[PDB]
Structure formats: structure tokens, C-alpha cells
């Protein structure tokens, strides 16, 4: 159907619009199809437009190949004729053929590599790499995305735009109504949000609490904590979910039997995702490490998170800047940018906590300028929230939540709101 | 391709003002092609207008030739249709063919003079120049080109630049009286313009307002954003164009009936351009990718942007520098220079927004030195706008836009101008 | 490392316990190693215990075959020792080797499938899986590794 592929590329604009990038000369033939595709792609990169049949002939005249393939291409361009088909079945056929041919090429090369490796040391060649090439080429043939985007035309793409407007998809709601109503839709996927509380002001508690909340919403959660060990956070999640205690996890006031029973009674609910907690040494974690983690999760554990959580992003490493070549500001901003880029590249909700300078420590109000490490990070951040705990407020077993950085709407809509933080149970709740 | 150029001269009026002068009878052929060119050139000489096909066969029968040549010209005149291929591709192919024929006739001249050189002087013809007259002819053989690569010639092309000064030269109206006033012609093509402002002040709203104005002016707009986009600025364009406040969009006030009506109504308007909004990862969209994006836009779509917008800026991650620059001076300035150079190469209006340092995050007035980005960036700029929003300005829902880097005009007597920035509809409303 | 693998399976207990199901008859060799590990698995299944050298010798004696490989199988069980090496290094190397063997087997099977495809359809053994089965085994080839157990899951790690 390669003739059909070429014809629908040439005479149909939407067809070429669908899949140009996954078109490559080694997908067609060792003869006329490859040569004509090469000519077409040369035109593509030379003039940045769809060649006309006349343009095809023009390029054909200024050719270098000899007579036989010249006549073959002439016939093929003569064979190039438009036919009426559908916008859907053609996609399925073209992809099927792409996958088939990619697998054929990969397996052909595999045979060549195997043969070379079978030959005696004198007879074999360094031209064909060793068997080590067998696994990498195979995964390549299976890493073709078959899916690409171009951008959102404001006029041409209003249908799905209104579909989103009514649907409000990609904004995952919270389990607490105050946050949903101040965000008006919950939390967007490619978003990074930070909390500023201070030192032992409820940071990790809020992080694990929100992790549990989203996990209860049938969601794949990733809670990567560096300052806190996975087991410690596992215990915090035990306290939040099982709702027994933290002071009872140690000096166990609860039987293993009832713990197991409530564990099973939570296991039956399909309304719960998968959450795995990972820990790394301070300043030894980078975005590339996180990406490789995601890759191996999908490969071996077939897991892909959506609400990825990083504890105190400020103790990661940029993987670009050399080792502490500057102060906190630069590396902090760079890490913020890198992690937000990864999150939007994976559409995974990103949350973290930022330090507060000693000037705002033990203060009833915290401002944006009260940030400790950097100011580029507040620029990079979306929907920063400030958690304040006062002696009276702590005695009320609550904290005050203020908006310092808004993205989903007005900041002054509901500036002050309280959380019933339970240090004992590791869970904050609305006061209503 | 002779038929192609003939048909385009006959039919494409646009392909007659670009290059008529570089048409010569000896370019075409020894066959009927030069005869047809002589016929049409004679018609152009007698009547300064493109003769029609009937006028063409009238000249053919009017002019007397051999039966073989009569039939040959008869076949050529019988092969001419519109066939609207690419303008740039057409002109480049014609340039290539003209160069080919120039070299061909130069080769004929040199071989014939060389053959005439060896024979005795009695057999020599006084008409042929001596063998020492080869280079200038070869020079004038290779001097054949269409572009004025010589560049401007002062005191000689003063007519063309006078026509430019008369009315408006290469420029784009801002759709607002005050902006065009302070530019006196709007913004010029190929110029690098920046709109620096504070974090969350007037930046994205201004970008969307300008994009909406340029689209309403029928221009092709390309909004490349490193922030959240394809749905976020898209909603802002909905607010500016459809006059629907964002909160209404979120709450679903529209019934999708009036939405569809407005969309198709704007589709009815012929004064609307094409706008493509594309979002790319933070730190991975270089100028090289930018050019490839332009190529893809022109390939998959019939789109060549007239205006291009950038968000936040400095996110291009220019490949010129491998590592982050300490103060980002080299990197940011390189990005700005590449943007301006690309705009020149495309002769397009490029807009972006710079960052303001922490020193002026709350200052009632912003100086040029109040630049979070590099100091070399406010040197490659051509039009540096700066907006400030204060509590008073928020109360008035206005701003205090200030002009700097006034390359278009003088940076005086207009800097104290204010706009009714609409926080609900994402647009600028200059006071009348 | 088949010597080391068989020695530690016989001798080391945590070695056997760690990844026993991660051991297939085709992981080892087309020759005497396959037969010896067949005896190993036979004694494991018949007796839910770690066989002694004498036990497997008795098994090979009673469960015999033609003498051409009988010498090979009897001499193969003559070298397995204690050899107190590193457990982590052991499991890493074994996983690497088993991945090599899985790649080899998937490759060869794809070779056979294509070879039958590179044959007149009438003269093709219908029993063999067809070309459409070629991609999936590739996935099956790559979806073979030891559980690193990276990270902790709050739910299934309650034990
Ligand atoms: N181990 C603990 N024992 C008792 N109470 C605790 C313990 N950990 C936390 N709390 C209480 O719960 C609150 C919330 O602490 P977390 O948010 O879990 O930690 P954190 O504030 O992120 O810690 P750092 O060290 O400042 S990053 C604390 O301020 C205490 O009131
Ligand atoms: N839909 C909207 N409703 C109300 N105000 C809006 C809306 N969109 C934008 N604005 C206002 O316009 C500005 C939007 O932020 P910008 O000035 O574009 O800064 P920014 O690009 O978000 O900055 P950073 O540094 O990248 S977070 C702020 O003053 C907002 O209050
Ligand atoms: Mg913490
Ligand atoms: Mg913005």
C-alpha cells in the first residue's frame, strides 16, 4: 500500500498532516519507493511545503540516479493518483505497515549481527557490531511513538477546547473541598506546586496527607522523599489512611491482626491507585534519575505515576550546573525548571515544599519575599501555599493557610483558611 | 520546465512583477520555446499587458514560420494552465533554470571561440572577440542572479525608499491608535521587540492581546509558549475575541450554541489570519528547533507566520553555549540575538517578554537597569515596553506602560501612557 | 557461570531460595547442563528439599539414558562446591546471563519463524507460530529481569 501512502501524502493535506515524522525511507523498499520518498523528503526539507506533481517531475529531471530507477520513479509518479478514503482506516493501515516494516528491518539486522557473531574470529568483521546490538535495536523498533502533535490553533481547534471547558479534564480534584473551590477545578497535570511552612511546621505531614488523598482517588502516586526515609513516610501514610495513630505504631497499642484486617478491607476497594515511595541521598537526585526511574517502573513494575511528589526539591541536583558552582539561588531555580519540565513532559502533578528564611521564622505572617533559597523558583512555581503554625494556632491543633502565589485565579479570593492538622494522625482536614 | 515558466508568466500575474527583466530569448531553447517567447515578448512590447491564449494563437497564426515550427508552437500554446504552485519554489526553480541556461550558452560561446581560435587568421572572423575576452563574459555569465545582494544603493534607489516612506513601509499596525502613534507605522518586520514586566503583572495578557489584534488584522500569528499553553493562553484568546470572561468559561455559562455561533461567525470574516499556539518544554526549544517548527508549520499546514510571540524568554536554551552562563549574560544575549536574526531572516514581527529583577518587584517605577535577565538583552532589543501594576492601577484595572529602547521613534513625550487592561477578558483597552 | 550457578544451587540455600522460579531448563545449555539441571528440578519437585550430591547421583543412575551423554551428565556433577562468594554479585551475574539466554532464544525462534515465512506457504509447518507472533516474544524477551524491588509501596508491603 506504499503507493497509497505516497498518494495520500501528496494529494491529501490531512493525511500528510497526520504522520510525517514517522515516515522514513527505510520503511518502504530497496528500490523505487525508497528513492521517491527520498526525493519527496528532500523537497520537504528544501522548500518546507507539499510538492506538486509538477514539482515532483521537476525534481525528477534534476536527478542523479541512472535510467532504470529513473523510469521506475516516472511510472510511480504516473501511478500517483488521488483516491477517496476515510480519515481513520488509512491511519490504522499506515501504522500497521510501519510497525510491520520496522520489525522486519530490526529482525533482518538481528540475523546479520547473529551471523557475524557466529563466524570464527578471523572470518567475522567489526562492520557488524557484536550481539550487544541485538537487544538495543529490538527495543528501538518498539519505541516508535506513532503519535505526534503540532500545536493548538485557536480557531481550528475549538471543538476539543469546548470539550475541555465543559469537561475540565486534566485538572485532578483534591479530597478536600476548600482546595478544589479555591483552585476551581482541582489540580492540573503539568503543574508544580509548593508549600512554605518552615522547620517542623507541618510540611511532611501535609505532603503525605495529600499523597494519601490522591491515592484514595484511584491514582498512581509517586512520593519521592529525600529528607525523609520511605519507611518513615510509609508509617505516616499508615497513620493517615489506617487512621490509628503514629504514637501507637511504636509501642504497638494495636494488634497485627486488626492492622492486617483493615489492610485487607482497604485492599478490596478498587477506588485506590498505586503509590510507591522512593528515597535518595541529599543533592544526589536529578531529573534524569527520575526519568530513568519512571522508565524502569513502566518496564518492570509496569507503573506510571501521575501525582509525583518531591520532598524539599531544594536538596536535589540540577544535573546541568557543575557541583555547587554558584549559590543556592541558581541551582534551586534550575532544579525547579527541570522538574517542572519533566512534569509537563509526563503530565504528572508535581508537589514540593520550600524553606522559609529565618527572618519569617516564628512569625504570624509569611510573604513571598520570605522565601529562603531563591526567587526564580517562585516565578517557576504554580499555586504556592503558605502554612503558618502559631502557639495559639498549634494549641488549636490547626494551621493557617494563605495564598502567596496563585495561578488558577485570584489570590485574594479566600486568603486565610485553616487546616485541622493532626500531628498524631498525620492528616489535615477542612474546618467545615 | 519551460512549459511551467511559460504557463506561470501567462497565468500568474504575481509571477510577472518579481522577475520579468531576467527573461532572454537565448535562455529558452533552440526549439519552439524561444519562438513562443519571442511571440509573447513581442505582444508585451506592442501592448504592455499579458496576452491571452487566444491572443497567443492569434500571434502564432499572425507570424509566419515553417510548417514544422508552426506545429511545434501550436503544441506549446496548447499546454498552459493556472496550476498554482508555490511562489518561492517557482522563483527558485526559475532561478536555477536560468543559471543552468546561462552556463550552457557560456559553454557554447567558449567552445565556439576556442574552435575559431586555432584556425589561421584568414579563416578568422572579425566578429568573434579575441580569446582574452572570456572572463568578463564568464563574469557576466556568473553575475546572473535575481536578488539585490549588492544591497541598498543610496542616491540611486531613492525612488523605492521614497515610496516606502510614502504611506507605510514594511510594518504591521498594532490595531491600537496609540501604539501605532508611538511607532508612527506600527512595528517593523524582522525587528526584535520585548515587553518586560513583573511576575504576574501584565505579561501573558499583553501577549494574548497583541496576538488577538494581529490575528484580527489578518496576519499569521505563532504563539510559542514555555508556560502552560495550548489551553491556557487559548482561553485568554477566547476571552479577548469571544468576549467571554474566563470565569464564565470555567463555570460553563456558555451553552456551546453561542460559542459555535461566534466561532463560525469569525470563520465567516475574511479579515482573520491564522494563529497556531505551540507549547514546548522549559529549556529545550532552541532557535534551531524554532526554524524546524516554522518548516513544519509551512509543511503540514498552509501556514507561514507573520508575527511570533515568546513567553518569559531566556528559555530557548541556545546551543551556542553549552553551560549556563554565570549571570546568564552570554546565553541570554545570544538568545536575543538569535531571535532577532531569525526574525530578520523571516522578515517577521517577533515579540517576547523579559524578566524584572527582585529590586523592582514592588517599585512603582522600573528603570532599564531593573532587568532580571542579562544587560545585553536590552541592547539587541528594538522596542522594549514595560508595564507596572500597582494597587492603585489594580483598583483602576489599568497599568502604567512605559516605553524604552525606542528604536522606532523617540523615547520621550509618550512614555506616560496608560491602558485599560481587562483582567476578565484578557485584553488592552486604550482610552480614547 | 553454569558451574557456579549449579554449585550454589546445590550448596547455597539462600541462593536457591532467592530466585528458584527464575530458572528454566532452557536457561542453561543444550547439553549436559540441561540434563543436570533437569535432575535438579526433578529432585526439587519429587522432594521439597535440597538434594545432596549422592541424591542426584542416585537420580541420574536410576533415571538414565543413552551412554553417549551419560558420561557427560555423570562427569558434570563432579565439580560443584561450597565456594563462598558474594550473593549479590551471584544474582546480578545470573540475571545478566539469563537475560542473554532469553535474548538468544527469542532471537532463534524469530529466525525460525521468518525462515518458515521465507518458504512456500504450502511447504510450511502449521504448528510453528506465525510471523505475527514475532513481536510479542520480543517483548517477552525484554520483560525478563530480576525484581530489584526498588522503592516501597504503602499497600502491598504491609507484610
Ligand atoms: N516523629 C514525630 N513525633 C511527634 N510528632 C511529630 C513527629 N513528626 C512530626 N510530628 C508533628 O507533626 C508536625 C508535622 O511534621 P512533618 O510535616 O511530618 O515534618 P516536617 O515539618 O516536614 O519536618 P522538617 O524536619 O521540618 S523537613 C510536626 O510539626 C509535629 O507537630
Ligand atoms: N484569566 C485571568 N484572570 C484574571 N487576571 C488574569 C488572568 N490572566 C492573566 N491575568 C493577570 O495578568 C497577569 C498574568 O501574569 P503575567 O503578567 O503574564 O506573568 P506570568 O507570565 O504568569 O509570570 P511568571 O513569572 O512566568 S509565573 C497578572 O497580572 C494576572 O493577574
Ligand atoms: Mg518534610
Ligand atoms: Mg506567563
UniProtKB/Swiss-Prot annotation, chains A, B:
<dbReference type="GO" id="GO:0016787">
    <property type="term" value="F:hydrolase activity"/>
</dbReference>
<keyword id="KW-0238">DNA-binding</keyword>
<dbReference type="InterPro" id="IPR007694">
    <property type="entry name" value="DNA_helicase_DnaB-like_C"/>
</dbReference>
<dbReference type="GO" id="GO:0017116">
    <property type="term" value="F:single-stranded DNA helicase activity"/>
</dbReference>
<dbReference type="InterPro" id="IPR046393">
    <property type="entry name" value="Helic_T4"/>
</dbReference>
<keyword id="KW-0067">ATP-binding</keyword>
<dbReference type="GO" id="GO:0006269">
    <property type="term" value="P:DNA replication, synthesis of primer"/>
</dbReference>
<dbReference type="GO" id="GO:0003677">
    <property type="term" value="F:DNA binding"/>
</dbReference>
<feature type="binding site">
    <location>
        <begin position="197"/>
        <end position="204"/>
    </location>
    <ligand>
        <name>ATP</name>
    </ligand>
</feature>
<comment type="similarity">
    <text>Belongs to the helicase family. DnaB subfamily.</text>
</comment>
<protein>
    <recommendedName>
        <fullName>DnaB-like replicative helicase</fullName>
        <ecNumber>3.6.4.-</ecNumber>
    </recommendedName>
</protein>
<dbReference type="Pfam" id="PF03796">
    <property type="entry name" value="DnaB_C"/>
</dbReference>
<dbReference type="GO" id="GO:0003678">
    <property type="term" value="F:DNA helicase activity"/>
</dbReference>
<keyword id="KW-0378">Hydrolase</keyword>
<comment type="subunit">
    <text>Homohexamer. The homohexamer is a trimer of asymmetric dimers. Interacts with the DNA primase; this interaction forms the active primosome complex, which is composed of 6 helicase and 1 primase subunits and expresses full helicase and primase activities. Interacts (via C-terminus) with the helicase assembly factor; this interaction brings about the rapid assembly of the helicase onto ssDNA.</text>
</comment>
<feature type="domain" description="SF4 helicase">
    <location>
        <begin position="165"/>
        <end position="432"/>
    </location>
</feature>
<dbReference type="GO" id="GO:0039686">
    <property type="term" value="P:bidirectional double-stranded viral DNA replication"/>
</dbReference>
<keyword id="KW-1194">Viral DNA replication</keyword>
<keyword id="KW-0547">Nucleotide-binding</keyword>
<keyword id="KW-0639">Primosome</keyword>
<dbReference type="InterPro" id="IPR027417">
    <property type="entry name" value="P-loop_NTPase"/>
</dbReference>
<keyword id="KW-0347">Helicase</keyword>
<comment type="function">
    <text>ATP-dependent DNA helicase essential for viral DNA replication and recombination. The helicase moves 5' -&gt; 3' on the lagging strand template, unwinding the DNA duplex ahead of the leading strand polymerase at the replication fork and generating ssDNA for both leading and lagging strand synthesis. Interaction with the primase allows the primase to initiate lagging strand synthesis and fully activates the helicase. Loaded by the helicase assembly factor on replication forks that begin at discrete replication origin sequences, as well as on forks that are created during recombination.</text>
</comment>
<dbReference type="GO" id="GO:0005524">
    <property type="term" value="F:ATP binding"/>
</dbReference>
<keyword id="KW-0235">DNA replication</keyword>
